[PDB]
Design a protein around this ligand. Structure first.
Ligand code: NI
Length: 341
């Protein structure tokens, strides 16, 4: 049974609600982004209208085989009427094709559903500037002040400088980057660009990337692993055992691995600056965990909510414990008392 925080009142709509069977009253199912916790339950046998971005709809058609007649792609930043209700999709600054959804209810209520997002001051000049929001369905993944991490640009600067140094010292080093979903593509694309290489990967991963409308992608990626000095591997293989095994397969072309694991936040963020990050090393293998987030930090979240001034907040993450819920509610009230709304 579908939980309340996935339903949009006053409509026939649900958000990210595909794992509950046929939801009573639902005439259109919205999908914010192509991450498995959110698409859980979609497959080629789905027969109700799915509304989403163009990129999400490429992934549904080619990776999940959803039939074309049930996929309804909407342009961004454009007022659209769906089953008699005005909606807008906005870029969520999450993974490729991820959106926030603005719903203009027939009674005058305005609802923003963030999906998953990384709040940014650029959102203060989208179509959100123009009107009041009554209800905010909020991605609360990192809603506590201990959750700090650097900008994506500082993280990428670290990665490119680390990779370029290592490979200039040893031209026979291979770089490997872990992946298990879409998102975070700038990590491996920025490192390959500084090294003058295409990125090499499995046919399954190449297929996924080919759905993402990235400019000039054919110039940036390949399935010919032998021609590439930046490889992608599943995240589960980014360990000393799995990397040893990979280095054997490369036919003595390489004699060292430098590997990256983009994580979200880890507790080493509560002590160490990005500049001071060091790898774990065993012989000719080194592994860097880098804090590349596609979710809001606490400060970024707070800034966004204090600017938007919603009347009511409904969290969509960390909802399963009373301690989490109470924590989140306390910070919402602080934010409102501090800013005066
Ligand atoms: Ni996500």
């Amino acid at each position: 049974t579908c939980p309340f925080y996935k339903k949009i009142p006053g409509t026939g709509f649900t958000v990210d609600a595909f794992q509950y069977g046929v939801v009573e009253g639902c005439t259109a199912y919205f999908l914010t982004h192509f991450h498995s916790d959110h698409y859980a339950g979609l497959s080629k046998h789905f027969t109700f209208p799915v509304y989403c971005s163009e990129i999400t709809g490429n992934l549904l058609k080619n990776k999940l085989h959803v039939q074309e007649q049930y996929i309804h792609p909407l342009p961004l930043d454009t007022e659209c009427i769906v089953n008699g209700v005005k909606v807008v999709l906005l870029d969520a600054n999450h993974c490729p094709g991820a959106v926030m959804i603005l719903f203009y209810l027939p009674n005058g209520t305005v609802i923003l559903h963030t999906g998953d997002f990384r709040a940014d001051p650029s959102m203060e000049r989208s179509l959100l500037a123009d009107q009041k929001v009554h209800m905010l369905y909020l991605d609360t993944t990192y809603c506590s002040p201990e959750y700090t991490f650097p900008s994506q640009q500082e993280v990428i600067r670290f990665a490119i400088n680390t990779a370029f140094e290592a490979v200039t010292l040893n031209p026979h080093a291979l770089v490997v980057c872990g992946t298990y979903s879409i998102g975070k593509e700038k990590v491996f694309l920025a490192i390959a660009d500084v090294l003058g290489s295409k990125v090499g990967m499995s046919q399954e991963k190449y297929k996924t990337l080919q759905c993402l409308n990235i400019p000039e992608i054919n110039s940036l990626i390949t399935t010919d692993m032998c021609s590439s000095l930046v490889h992608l591997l599943p995240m589960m293989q980014i360990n000393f055992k799995g990397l040893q095994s990979h280095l054997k397969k490369c036919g003595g072309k390489y004699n060292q691995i430098l590997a990256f694991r983009p994580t979200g936040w880890t507790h080493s963020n509560k002590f160490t600056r990005i500049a001071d990050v060091i790898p774990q090393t065993k012989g000719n293998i080194s592994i860097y965990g880098i804090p590349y987030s596609e979710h809001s930090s606490y400060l970024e979240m707070k800034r966004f909510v204090q600017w938007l001034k919603p009347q009511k907040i409904i969290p969509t993450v960390n909802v399963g414990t009373w301690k989490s819920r109470s924590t989140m509610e306390k910070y919402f009230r602080e934010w409102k008392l501090e800013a005066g709304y």
